[PDB]
Design a protein around this motif. Structure first.
Motif, short mmCIF file in Angstrom:
data_model
loop_
_atom_site.label_atom_id
_atom_site.label_comp_id
_atom_site.label_asym_id
_atom_site.label_seq_id
_atom_site.Cartn_x
_atom_site.Cartn_y
_atom_site.Cartn_z
N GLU A 30 -3.69 -26.81 5.73
CA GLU A 30 -3.86 -25.37 5.70
C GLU A 30 -2.52 -24.69 5.96
OE1 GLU A 30 -6.77 -25.31 8.66
OE2 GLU A 30 -5.38 -25.27 10.36
N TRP A 31 -2.45 -23.41 5.61
CA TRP A 31 -1.23 -22.64 5.79
C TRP A 31 -1.59 -21.16 5.84
CZ3 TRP A 31 -2.76 -24.46 1.08
CH2 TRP A 31 -2.87 -23.52 0.06
N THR A 32 -0.69 -20.37 6.42
CA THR A 32 -0.90 -18.94 6.56
C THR A 32 -0.03 -18.17 5.59
OG1 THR A 32 0.78 -18.67 8.27
CG2 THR A 32 -1.43 -19.29 8.98
N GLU A 34 1.60 -15.48 6.25
CA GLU A 34 2.84 -15.15 6.94
C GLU A 34 3.84 -16.30 6.85
OE1 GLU A 34 0.07 -14.50 10.60
OE2 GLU A 34 1.85 -15.52 11.40
N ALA A 35 3.34 -17.53 6.84
CA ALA A 35 4.22 -18.69 6.73
C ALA A 35 4.95 -18.71 5.39
CB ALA A 35 3.42 -19.98 6.93
N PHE A 38 7.42 -15.11 5.03
CA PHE A 38 8.63 -14.94 5.83
C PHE A 38 9.43 -16.23 5.93
CE2 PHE A 38 5.44 -11.97 7.71
CZ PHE A 38 5.99 -10.82 7.20
N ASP A 39 9.22 -17.15 5.00
CA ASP A 39 10.00 -18.37 4.96
C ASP A 39 11.27 -18.16 4.15
OD1 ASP A 39 9.40 -21.33 5.90
OD2 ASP A 39 10.48 -21.48 4.00
N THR A 40 12.29 -18.95 4.47
CA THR A 40 13.56 -18.86 3.75
C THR A 40 13.46 -19.51 2.37
OG1 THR A 40 14.53 -20.94 4.52
CG2 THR A 40 14.61 -19.05 6.01
N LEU A 44 8.59 -23.18 -1.16
CA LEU A 44 7.93 -24.01 -0.15
C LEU A 44 6.56 -24.46 -0.62
CD1 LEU A 44 7.53 -25.31 2.54
CD2 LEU A 44 7.23 -23.07 3.58
N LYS B 1 1.85 -24.64 8.14
CA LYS B 1 0.80 -24.00 8.92
C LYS B 1 1.21 -22.59 9.33
N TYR B 2 1.70 -22.44 10.55
CA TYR B 2 2.12 -21.16 11.09
C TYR B 2 3.63 -21.02 11.01
N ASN B 3 4.11 -19.79 11.22
CA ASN B 3 5.53 -19.50 11.16
C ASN B 3 5.99 -18.68 12.36
OD1 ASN B 3 4.10 -17.23 10.18
ND2 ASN B 3 5.97 -16.45 9.21
N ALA B 4 5.61 -19.11 13.57
CA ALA B 4 6.01 -18.47 14.81
C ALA B 4 7.50 -18.16 14.82
CB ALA B 4 5.65 -19.35 16.00
N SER B 10 8.91 -22.70 13.91
CA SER B 10 7.90 -22.68 12.87
C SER B 10 7.31 -24.07 12.67
CB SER B 10 8.50 -22.17 11.55
OG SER B 10 8.55 -20.75 11.53
N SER B 11 6.08 -24.10 12.16
CA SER B 11 5.39 -25.37 11.97
C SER B 11 6.13 -26.25 10.97
CB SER B 11 3.95 -25.13 11.52
OG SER B 11 3.92 -24.43 10.29
N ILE B 12 6.63 -25.65 9.89
CA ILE B 12 7.28 -26.44 8.84
C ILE B 12 8.59 -27.03 9.34
CG2 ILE B 12 8.31 -24.34 7.89
CD1 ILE B 12 7.36 -27.66 6.11
N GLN B 15 14.26 -22.71 10.84
CA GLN B 15 14.43 -21.56 9.96
C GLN B 15 15.88 -21.11 10.00
OE1 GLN B 15 11.60 -20.21 7.26
NE2 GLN B 15 11.46 -21.60 9.01
N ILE B 16 16.46 -20.87 8.82
CA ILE B 16 17.88 -20.55 8.75
C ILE B 16 18.10 -19.04 8.75
CG2 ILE B 16 18.80 -22.68 7.80
CD1 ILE B 16 18.18 -21.62 5.05
N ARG B 17 17.58 -18.34 7.75
CA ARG B 17 17.80 -16.91 7.60
C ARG B 17 16.62 -16.17 8.21
NH1 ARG B 17 22.00 -17.80 3.97
NH2 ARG B 17 23.19 -16.22 5.11
#
Lengths: 46, 48
Positions: A30-32, A34-35, A38-40, A44, B1-4, B10-12, B15-17
């Motif tokens: 699963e994934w959100t 927001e993930a 707001f990922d670089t 992904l 998953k999440y991106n705290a 972050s879950s993955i 994070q760079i930028r």
């Protein structure tokens, strides 16, 4: 297996057969939003 | 998953930028000129 001029019930034979057996038996992630957003890395998901 | 947020990783992974950089900058308008306009100019020659 012998014989004779008279013949008769002399050489009886048999046969058999064998059996086999099998089976069929038997994962997620699963994934959100927001993930992904707001990922670089924008690839992904791929 | 999440991106705290990066401080909470972050879950993955890392994070760079974390910031988006707005190219256009802010400047300050030059102060309007008053005394300079009112003036007389006298040329002072060289070698004198």
């Amino acid at each position: 297996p012998a014989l004779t001029e008279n013949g008769g019930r002399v050489n009886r034979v048999g046969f058999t057969r064998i059996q086999l057996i099998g089976s069929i038996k038997k994962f997620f992630y699963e994934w959100t939003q927001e993930a992904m957003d707001f990922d670089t890395d924008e690839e992904l998901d791929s | 998953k999440y991106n705290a947020p990066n401080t909470t990783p972050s879950s993955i992974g890392p994070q760079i930028r974390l910031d988006y950089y707005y190219k256009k900058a802010l400047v300050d308008a030059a102060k309007e000129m008053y005394f300079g306009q009112l003036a007389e100019v006298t040329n002072m020659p060289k070698n004198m």
